[PDB]
């Protein structure tokens with residue numbers, strides 16, 4: 001728990017929930033400071049949600065240095081991911097990726113998700129914007145503690161989230177990866193997506209997506225949650241593909 005051993009350098013956030021800043025802890029460690037707008041969250045919402053994030057530990061899950069809540073206002077202190085959101089990285093880096101690199105990114109996220117799944121945590125918003133790239137190229141899952149383009153059917157039809165809905169979400173995240181940051185169903189209204197999806201239509205195979213990686217992406221989009229593989233299973237399937 002941090003008092004103010006923090007140094008705010010510049011920001012990067014938006015929307016009531018707080019701002020995010022680039023900062024330093026102890027004039028040393030580069031960190032990402034997420035503050036929360038006053039009255040933008042019940043104090044017990046922040047308290048219990050924060051202690052949940054600190055109870056999670058995995059190499060493909062962004063880490064926390066501590067929290068600030070002595071009342072001035074309130075902020076969560078994360079390690080700094082040098083390359084921002086996977087969404088943004090894929091976009092500006094587009095055309096410079098090798099299929100192998102993109103597949104490695106998916107494996108990174110699947111690993112983090114496999115951990116969250118096993119720890120019975122649902123991520124309800126798994127997308128490229130919520131993934132972070134480090135000054136390694138390593139991908140870590142974030143924001144782990146409507147967007148119908150990432151929602152599975154049982155979620156369209158009023159919010160039945162689970163670890164299997166995250167898988168569907170992962171399938172779309174995989175599409176965003178191999179398409180190098182493209183927008184899924186860009187020229188389609190929510191209605192159209194739900195209609196096209198309810199007819200068995202799925203996002204096309206990006207060119208960088210091999211016929212084998214696109215089979216996997218379609219298992220994630222199986223209409224029935226029980227038919228979708230669990231992250232623990234996707235990990236080994238993606239792993240075997242990466243091997244050729």
Ligand SMILES: NS(=O)(=O)c1cccc(Nc2ncc3ccc4sc(-c5ccccc5)cc4c3n2)c1
Nearest residue numbers: 012013014020032034062078079080081082084085
């Ligand atoms: N995605 S960004 O803000 O352009 C950015 C740029 C450069 C570096 C970072 N690295 C970093 N490292 C650890 C983090 C750990 C938690 C959060 S929450 C958040 C956010 C929330 C709501 C709107 C916009 C941003 C960014 C980060 C975060 N971000 C992020």
